[PDB]
Each structure stands twice: as structure tokens, then as C-alpha cells.
Design an enzyme around this catalytic site. Sequence first.
Site, PDB file in Angstrom:
ATOM      1  N   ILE A   1     -21.488  88.988  81.198  1.00 29.38           N
ATOM      2  CA  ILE A   1     -20.694  87.836  81.361  1.00 29.38           C
ATOM      3  C   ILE A   1     -20.302  87.542  82.687  1.00 29.38           C
ATOM      4  CG2 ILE A   1     -20.166  87.735  78.964  1.00 29.38           C
ATOM      5  CD1 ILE A   1     -17.747  89.222  79.375  1.00 29.38           C
ATOM      6  N   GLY A   2     -20.002  88.434  83.602  1.00 28.52           N
ATOM      7  CA  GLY A   2     -19.547  88.289  85.149  1.00 28.52           C
ATOM      8  C   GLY A   2     -20.076  89.317  86.165  1.00 28.52           C
ATOM      9  N   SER A   3     -19.624  89.085  87.292  1.00 25.51           N
ATOM     10  CA  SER A   3     -20.267  89.849  88.642  1.00 25.51           C
ATOM     11  C   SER A   3     -19.480  89.594  89.855  1.00 25.51           C
ATOM     12  CB  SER A   3     -21.887  89.473  88.461  1.00 25.51           C
ATOM     13  OG  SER A   3     -21.812  88.191  89.283  1.00 25.51           O
ATOM     14  N   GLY A   4     -19.998  90.271  90.927  1.00 24.69           N
ATOM     15  CA  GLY A   4     -19.393  90.155  92.233  1.00 24.69           C
ATOM     16  C   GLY A   4     -18.008  90.492  92.324  1.00 24.69           C
TER      17      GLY A   4
ATOM     18  N   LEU B   1     -19.242  93.455  87.626  1.00 25.55           N
ATOM     19  CA  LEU B   1     -20.224  93.535  86.613  1.00 25.55           C
ATOM     20  C   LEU B   1     -19.505  93.785  85.530  1.00 25.55           C
ATOM     21  CD1 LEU B   1     -23.437  95.373  85.959  1.00 25.55           C
ATOM     22  CD2 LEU B   1     -23.138  93.216  87.202  1.00 25.55           C
ATOM     23  N   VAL B   2     -19.378  92.532  84.616  1.00 23.51           N
ATOM     24  CA  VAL B   2     -18.713  92.796  83.260  1.00 23.51           C
ATOM     25  C   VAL B   2     -19.647  92.099  82.218  1.00 23.51           C
ATOM     26  CG1 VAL B   2     -16.862  92.209  81.872  1.00 23.51           C
ATOM     27  CG2 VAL B   2     -16.635  91.964  84.242  1.00 23.51           C
TER      28      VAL B   2
ATOM     29  N   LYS C   1     -16.675  96.886  81.892  1.00 25.54           N
ATOM     30  CA  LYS C   1     -16.941  96.482  83.600  1.00 25.54           C
ATOM     31  C   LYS C   1     -17.243  97.598  84.098  1.00 25.54           C
ATOM     32  CE  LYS C   1     -13.010  94.071  86.089  1.00 25.54           C
ATOM     33  NZ  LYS C   1     -11.950  93.831  86.300  1.00 25.54           N
TER      34      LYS C   1
ATOM     35  N   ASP D   1      -1.628  91.269  92.885  1.00 29.55           N
ATOM     36  CA  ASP D   1      -2.714  90.359  92.803  1.00 29.55           C
ATOM     37  C   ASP D   1      -2.638  89.353  91.441  1.00 29.55           C
ATOM     38  OD1 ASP D   1      -5.098  88.967  93.650  1.00 29.55           O
ATOM     39  OD2 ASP D   1      -6.580  90.636  92.888  1.00 29.55           O
TER      40      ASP D   1
HETATM   41  C1  LIG Z   1     -13.278  84.826  86.983  1.00 24.87           C
HETATM   42  C2  LIG Z   1     -13.879  85.196  85.760  1.00 24.87           C
HETATM   43  C3  LIG Z   1     -14.123  86.449  85.472  1.00 24.87           C
HETATM   44  O1  LIG Z   1     -13.921  87.583  86.641  1.00 24.87           O
HETATM   45  N1  LIG Z   1     -14.846  86.810  84.471  1.00 24.87           N
HETATM   46  C4  LIG Z   1     -15.193  88.298  83.911  1.00 24.87           C
HETATM   47  C5  LIG Z   1     -15.848  88.063  82.609  1.00 24.87           C
HETATM   48  C6  LIG Z   1     -15.278  86.618  82.176  1.00 24.87           C
HETATM   49  N2  LIG Z   1     -16.062  85.843  81.235  1.00 24.87           N
HETATM   50  C7  LIG Z   1     -15.683  86.264  79.959  1.00 24.87           C
HETATM   51  N3  LIG Z   1     -16.258  85.356  79.206  1.00 24.87           N
HETATM   52  C8  LIG Z   1     -15.920  85.378  78.027  1.00 24.87           C
HETATM   53  C9  LIG Z   1     -16.854  84.541  76.684  1.00 24.87           C
HETATM   54  N4  LIG Z   1     -16.971  83.200  77.446  1.00 24.87           N
HETATM   55  C10 LIG Z   1     -15.596  82.674  77.506  1.00 24.87           C
HETATM   56  C11 LIG Z   1     -15.647  81.086  77.203  1.00 24.87           C
HETATM   57  O2  LIG Z   1     -16.114  80.660  76.172  1.00 24.87           O
HETATM   58  C12 LIG Z   1     -17.323  81.104  76.251  1.00 24.87           C
HETATM   59  C13 LIG Z   1     -17.633  82.577  76.197  1.00 24.87           C
HETATM   60  C14 LIG Z   1     -15.388  86.376  77.623  1.00 24.87           C
HETATM   61  C15 LIG Z   1     -14.493  87.329  78.517  1.00 24.87           C
HETATM   62  N5  LIG Z   1     -13.697  88.455  77.941  1.00 24.87           N
HETATM   63  C16 LIG Z   1     -13.176  89.488  78.826  1.00 24.87           C
HETATM   64  N6  LIG Z   1     -12.465  90.072  78.063  1.00 24.87           N
HETATM   65  C17 LIG Z   1     -11.913  91.194  79.272  1.00 24.87           C
HETATM   66  C18 LIG Z   1     -10.961  92.333  79.061  1.00 24.87           C
HETATM   67  C19 LIG Z   1     -10.728  92.950  80.229  1.00 24.87           C
HETATM   68  C20 LIG Z   1     -11.115  92.687  81.439  1.00 24.87           C
HETATM   69  N7  LIG Z   1     -12.381  91.773  81.491  1.00 24.87           N
HETATM   70  C21 LIG Z   1     -12.404  90.954  80.333  1.00 24.87           C
HETATM   71  S1  LIG Z   1     -13.589  89.319  80.459  1.00 24.87           S
HETATM   72  N8  LIG Z   1     -14.758  87.162  79.750  1.00 24.87           N
HETATM   73  C22 LIG Z   1     -15.328  85.898  83.567  1.00 24.87           C
END
Ligand SMILES: C=CC(=O)N1CC[C@H](Nc2nc(CN3CCOCC3)cc(Nc3nc4cccnc4s3)n2)C1
Length: 240
Positions: A15-18, A19-20, A34, A119
Amino acid sequence: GSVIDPSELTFVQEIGSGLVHLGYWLNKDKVAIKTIEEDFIEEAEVMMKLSHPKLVQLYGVCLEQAPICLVFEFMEHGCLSDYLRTQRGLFAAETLLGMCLDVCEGMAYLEEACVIHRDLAARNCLVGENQVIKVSDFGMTPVKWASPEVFSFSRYSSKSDVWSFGVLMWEVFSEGKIPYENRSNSEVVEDISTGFRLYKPRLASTHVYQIMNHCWKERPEDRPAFSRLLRQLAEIAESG
Ligand SMILES: C=CC(=O)N1CC[C@H](Nc2nc(CN3CCOCC3)cc(Nc3nc4cccnc4s3)n2)C1
């Protein structure tokens, strides 16, 4: 905190990088995993002993093999910055104030614990069910969120966090606009030093903007603490 073996984790979707990753722990709990050391791990330990409803929680840490990882609860709607952007035009002003209140409750707890975020920004807050906002990445020890004493002298404090919280308020009420968009770090520092402040977002009332401006007072001693901000915000949720 519990240590977690990587065999207990299922990686379902990046779902994320630059890694989640969205994944599962024990084929049961949804988690945000993460992926990356002593620093990374130390943040986890700090956060696992800070228990507040508006602060994100961890299930544990994975030390098995590099890259190591942290295992967090999964916040269903992602970061606050992206959420504000994708839902632009669908928020009532009261919902936006409620979001600021959530963040402020969490920051008042951190402030009382003598924990400085360093931050604070919409991208470091997460959105759960029913639009509950939790502060994330608060276990650490970008000029657009920095107070002047921070950008000039590295003097971090709860009052510098308060400056960042005013900018976050501007991000919320502007529904995810980028502050000082297209202005260079040099340009931001100069503008702030000469007294410039971010414009009033149109969804922000006169009273809300006053509070933003109290957060951006040049001297940290002139800014309110989070425990006081909290009540100021709440007062306005009735009349203002
Ligand atoms: C700047 C964005 C960022 O750093 N992200 C990391 C992951 C995050 N994205 C994300 N997406 C979802 C699911 N989408 C949301 C919108 O609708 C479509 C589906 C979920 C999510 N949840 C997270 N929970 C945690 C808990 C701790 C740390 N990071 C996260 S990200 N994240 C974006």
C-alpha cells in the site's frame, strides 16, 4: 512488546513505499506491516508504552531477518493527507474541526508525557473507522511544518509541535492542499521571517483562523500548549 516471527505474517497487498503492506498476523488480525535499525526498533518500544485513544498502536516488532519490520494495527482509511484529498467537497466544517480535536487530544497526551513529535503533519496522522484520527510516527528522538526556532536553530519542543499543529489545521480545513505550494525552502523561511502566514481556508471560520494564528506566533512562549488548545477548539465546536 511482543516480538513477532515473520512466518506469522501474510503479506497481502503493498500500500506504500519511499515499504508498507496490508497483511494479517496469525491469519487473524489485519495489520499494516512497515518494512525498514536500532533507531527503527527504539521508536516501536517508545510507542508501545504510550496508550491513548488518538495514538496509533502496535502489535509488535519483527526481528527475524533484515529488512526488519514493525507490525501496526491497520487504519482502514490511510493517511489523513490523502484522505482529505480523495474526499474533497464531502466534508462539513464540524467534521473537519472534529479531526483537529482528535489530533490535539493525542498531542496533549504526548505533551504531558514530555514526548516531542518533531514531524507533526497530516501525512503522519491516520484515519480509522468513523473518521477517527490517530497520530502516528510519534516515537522519534520538511521546512513547511517547522517553527522558526526549529528551522533556524533546531530548538524542538512541544511549542514547536504546536506550530506544526497549526499547519496541520490548515491542511485539514483546506482539505489537503499543499502548504506554500511551489515555494522553495528558502522562499518559505523568508516569507515567515517577514511575518507572512498561510491564508485562511474558505471552510475555516474567523475563530478557527485565530487559533491557527496563535499556533504560528513567532515566539514559542506566545503559543498555547496543546492542553489549552484542546479546550479552545472544543469551545468553538459549540459557538464559532
Ligand atoms: C503518505 C501516505 C503513506 O505514507 N501511506 C502509507 C500507507 C498508506 N496507505 C494506506 N492505505 C490504506 C487503504 N486505502 C485507504 C483509502 O481507501 C483505499 C484503501 C490503509 C492504510 N492503513 C495504515 N494503517 C497504518 C498503521 C500504522 C502505520 N501505517 C499505517 S498505513 N494505509 C499511505
